[PDB]
Amino acid sequence: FSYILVYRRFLFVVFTVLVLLPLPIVLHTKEAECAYTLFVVATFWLTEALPLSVTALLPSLMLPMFGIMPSKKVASAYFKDFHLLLIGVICLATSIEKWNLHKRIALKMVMMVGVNPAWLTLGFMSSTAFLSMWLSNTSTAAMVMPIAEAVVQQIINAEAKGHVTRKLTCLCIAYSSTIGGLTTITGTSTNLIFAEYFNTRYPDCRCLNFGSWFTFSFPAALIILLLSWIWLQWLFLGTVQQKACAEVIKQEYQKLGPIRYQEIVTLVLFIIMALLWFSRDPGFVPGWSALFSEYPGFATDSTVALLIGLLFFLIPAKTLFDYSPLITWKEFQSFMPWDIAILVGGGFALADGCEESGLSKWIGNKLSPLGSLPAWLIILISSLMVTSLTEVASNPATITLFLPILSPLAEAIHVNPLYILIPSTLCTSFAFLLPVANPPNAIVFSYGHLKVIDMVKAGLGVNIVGVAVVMLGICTWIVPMFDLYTYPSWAPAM
Amino acid sequence: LVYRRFLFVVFTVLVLLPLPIVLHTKEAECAYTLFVVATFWLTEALPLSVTALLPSLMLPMFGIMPSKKVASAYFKDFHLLLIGVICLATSIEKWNLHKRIALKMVMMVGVNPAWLTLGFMSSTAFLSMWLSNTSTAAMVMPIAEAVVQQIINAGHVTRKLTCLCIAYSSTIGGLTTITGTSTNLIFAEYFNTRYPDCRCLNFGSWFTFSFPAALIILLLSWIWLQWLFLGQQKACAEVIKQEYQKLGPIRYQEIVTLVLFIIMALLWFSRDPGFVPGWSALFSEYPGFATDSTVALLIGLLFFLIPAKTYSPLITWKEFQSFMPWDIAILVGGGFALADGCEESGLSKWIGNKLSPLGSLPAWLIILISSLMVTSLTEVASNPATITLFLPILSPLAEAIHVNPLYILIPSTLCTSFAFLLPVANPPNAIVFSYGHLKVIDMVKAGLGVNIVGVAVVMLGICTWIVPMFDLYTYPSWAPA
Numbered sequence A: 001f002s003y004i005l006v007y008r009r010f011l012f013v014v015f016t017v018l019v020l021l022p023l024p025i026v027l028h029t030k031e032a033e034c035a036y037t038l039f040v041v042a043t044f045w046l047t048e049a050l051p052l053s054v055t056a057l058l059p060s061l062m063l064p065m066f067g068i069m070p071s072k073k074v075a076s077a078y079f080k081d082f083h084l085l086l087i088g089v090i091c092l093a094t095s096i097e098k099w100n101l102h103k104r105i106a107l108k109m110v111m112m113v114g115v116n117p118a119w120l121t122l123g124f125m126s127s128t129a130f131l132s133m134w135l136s137n138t139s140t141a142a143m144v145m146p147i148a149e150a151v152v153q154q155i156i157n158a159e160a161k162g163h164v165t166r167k168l169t170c171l172c173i174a175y176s177s178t179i180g181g182l183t184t185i186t187g188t189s190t191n192l193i194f195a196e197y198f199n200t201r202y203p204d205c206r207c208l209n210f211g212s213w214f215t216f217s218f219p220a221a222l223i224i225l226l227l228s229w230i231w232l233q234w235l236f237l238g239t240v241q242q243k244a245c246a247e248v249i250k251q252e253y254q255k256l257g258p259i260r261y262q263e264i265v266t267l268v269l270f271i272i273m274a275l276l277w278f279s280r281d282p283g284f285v286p287g288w289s290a291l292f293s294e295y296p297g298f299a300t301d302s303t304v305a306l307l308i309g310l311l312f313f314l315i316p317a318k319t320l321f322d323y324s325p326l327i328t329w330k331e332f333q334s335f336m337p338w339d340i341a342i343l344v345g346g347g348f349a350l351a352d353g354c355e356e357s358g359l360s361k362w363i364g365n366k367l368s369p370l371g372s373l374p375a376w377l378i379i380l381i382s383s384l385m386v387t388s389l390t391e392v393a394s395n396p397a398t399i400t401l402f403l404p405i406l407s408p409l410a411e412a413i414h415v416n417p418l419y420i421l422i423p424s425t426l427c428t429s430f431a432f433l434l435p436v437a438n439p440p441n442a443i444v445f446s447y448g449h450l451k452v453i454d455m456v457k458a459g460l461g462v463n464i465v466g467v468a469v470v471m472l473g474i475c476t477w478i479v480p481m482f483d484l485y486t487y488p489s490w491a492p493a494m
Numbered sequence B: 001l002v003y004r005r006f007l008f009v010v011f012t013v014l015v016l017l018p019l020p021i022v023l024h025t026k027e028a029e030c031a032y033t034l035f036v037v038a039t040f041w042l043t044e045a046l047p048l049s050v051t052a053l054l055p056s057l058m059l060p061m062f063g064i065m066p067s068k069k070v071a072s073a074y075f076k077d078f079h080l081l082l083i084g085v086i087c088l089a090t091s092i093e094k095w096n097l098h099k100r101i102a103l104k105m106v107m108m109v110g111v112n113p114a115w116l117t118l119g120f121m122s123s124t125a126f127l128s129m130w131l132s133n134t135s136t137a138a139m140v141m142p143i144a145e146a147v148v149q150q151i152i153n154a155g156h157v158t159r160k161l162t163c164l165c166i167a168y169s170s171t172i173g174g175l176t177t178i179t180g181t182s183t184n185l186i187f188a189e190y191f192n193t194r195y196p197d198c199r200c201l202n203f204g205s206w207f208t209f210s211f212p213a214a215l216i217i218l219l220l221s222w223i224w225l226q227w228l229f230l231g232q233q234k235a236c237a238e239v240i241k242q243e244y245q246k247l248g249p250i251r252y253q254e255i256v257t258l259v260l261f262i263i264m265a266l267l268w269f270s271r272d273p274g275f276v277p278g279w280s281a282l283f284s285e286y287p288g289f290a291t292d293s294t295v296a297l298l299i300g301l302l303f304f305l306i307p308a309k310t311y312s313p314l315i316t317w318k319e320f321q322s323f324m325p326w327d328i329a330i331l332v333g334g335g336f337a338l339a340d341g342c343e344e345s346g347l348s349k350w351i352g353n354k355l356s357p358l359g360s361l362p363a364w365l366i367i368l369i370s371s372l373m374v375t376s377l378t379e380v381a382s383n384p385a386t387i388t389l390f391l392p393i394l395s396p397l398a399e400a401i402h403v404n405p406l407y408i409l410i411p412s413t414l415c416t417s418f419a420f421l422l423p424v425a426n427p428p429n430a431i432v433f434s435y436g437h438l439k440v441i442d443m444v445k446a447g448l449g450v451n452i453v454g455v456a457v458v459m460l461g462i463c464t465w466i467v468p469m470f471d472l473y474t475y476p477s478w479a480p481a
């Protein structure tokens, strides 16, 4: 009977594949065939019977076999615009670890803030969420991660518990970067789609702008961040030695030497890449996106990462009778996480197979017959629906689905069409459970410290915190701003 | 005095001095990302996977394609087949299955010096039918320098004969299958697009006209390579015996590997052209959904599931992503974004009418110039680089001179794989050059004699037995006027 115990994750794979086969065979519709794929692929990284990148190739195997989408179309989703930003930023992250730009930022910050385990997991949440309201969510988690990984590395190495304090700064960065993106419109991509859709569906309204979006979400994002900091720190880890452990940090700073030539070039290109992401289209000032304002939406944040990320292959670093560049590409293929680029692309082919089948439209059509309900319960069914569907799909894919559904739903029962749209837009970007749903969650699995069950157990509590603040906010301190109780005049009559 | 040291820093800035793109509107901008990428591919001023990301950078900057559209062309159906084939290539040499069927085609033939280098030339030509010719050249070459060491221990001339017969026979065997190399998979990807109504190019009909084409070449290359170099027996047949008795009986991890290698080879033929209908009639309502590359992912993903030891699978992901070439996935995918960048810009319509004065010579003369040009050009550049730049040039030329598009592209996707000279041409003969033998002059004399017999079979092929298979004089319903 002991042979079952050692092969417990091989018999499990052939079980759930065969026992769920009555679902797409008895039922013949393509919604029941995409639901079989969404039940098999999703439970293969929850229980983790297989590695995470093998199950991401399973969308590209049974979606052509069921007749949902061809093999040419399911293969064009494993490399999207996320991977051009992902490639061009780990050409920067490679050339700061080789020339050791970190350990000169981590051995300078630790001897300025002190070796405190409790007040350094708040400086990584309050500075990330301030940096995230100007940049994107992906480009913020890609910069502050190789520096804050070196900070927790040096404090552990200055001991002359370590496995559980590395899961904090991985999770406090993936969560604070998406929490700080709720504050402004141009802070994330989900808030920009809602701003474009509301200004054309309801013209002559004129309320949503910079500053008006801030003062109803900045009190909402500050309570979530201060409650996530208590919840994340308690779940993982709830001066005769301090004087000795503060001298190892100073002594390791002396053997570095002066700052060389090859660290200033990476420090300069760390700034120009950050001063071009911020100055692209900041909304309240025109930027260099108004120079290309004849082919709009062509040059994105991924061409900025490739413009400076490919300059590390050119700049000379050390003479040899050739020269040597900064990154040389031989130690780039060993530094690039090639398992994340398949795992993220596997979640993109599943969000494109649900749209082609109709399973995303099937769930959204069940929300429209809820007209015989109170005005607060129709939010509560809708707000937990978008948080569930955003764990398998991307955030710009869920908001374009539900905005043409909730807009005729917010006109038949004479309710204001911002009392439903606002608590469904903020809860769209509450992707905390799976790393296939959020690109800030995928620059956190590229370090090998967290498991999948450590994100589900620690991200399920942040969703209850995140929903209960917006549900509190939709009744207090937002209803005097946009007047969410009376039916407005920029809406249809009947 | 120091301008020779920083050699390709001052050479890399040719994005400045030939800049005649601010004068013209749109087609001079697309033919600026075609000439910068080409001179960086021919001269190799960059790591050769960096230049594939330059069409991802300066195509949206000019205003030709959006960044969401140029990014989707970096992952075709070729890459799902590339992942599934190098799941077999890991499990073949991790469990030493490649050392067993190489000491079996040796000692079944004799130890004669002219029969030894025919068993080596036919072993790697059969392994290259299914694997990529780069991957199977990295397996037989560690064995081919262990058999020849024990032969002479029972000199320098017979060493380099074995050095270049391994590299040349895998390149000959890299064709006869669409999934045998990356050059054949680029063309069939480019031919299923841009001519979608044509259904005449599959795995079955590719085997019929090109397997005679590589049986004349492989038999008259072994004769030619023997002529250039040359022309106690119980100890040679005993020193080979002890290594085959050093590896014990066939294990469980080697029986399973060659079962999943035969079944994957028994498929890709059971899509079954016009003789029989195969399992492409099982999925009848969806005609082109389950393609040639969803079988490589079906078999190749079973290696991570089948138990091997104590559990641990047949292969792990750690030894997969340290084994798969990610340089090829960016270089091939970076050429598809450039080939689809000269279709949304009208560059391959301006070349598709300026070569109308070329459409006055007879049809056999258009082939011989355009096949000797790409054969002379594939000796200095890599094989997915020369087939990338010429496919949006030859196929607009074919549609304007009233010739079949299969009449030019079939003898030009085979002649571009004839990289037999100096070793920067292809990693088939760059693996064997890393050893201390086969000086660069000895690859010219051994490469020129096999490149003449290479293009003489293709020029004899497309006039005798290929015309009754594709009807190359009868300009078709597709490729419209």
Ligand code: NA
Pocket: A132, A133, A134, A135, A136, A137, A177, A178, A180, A181, A182, A187, A188
């Ligand atoms: Na943000």
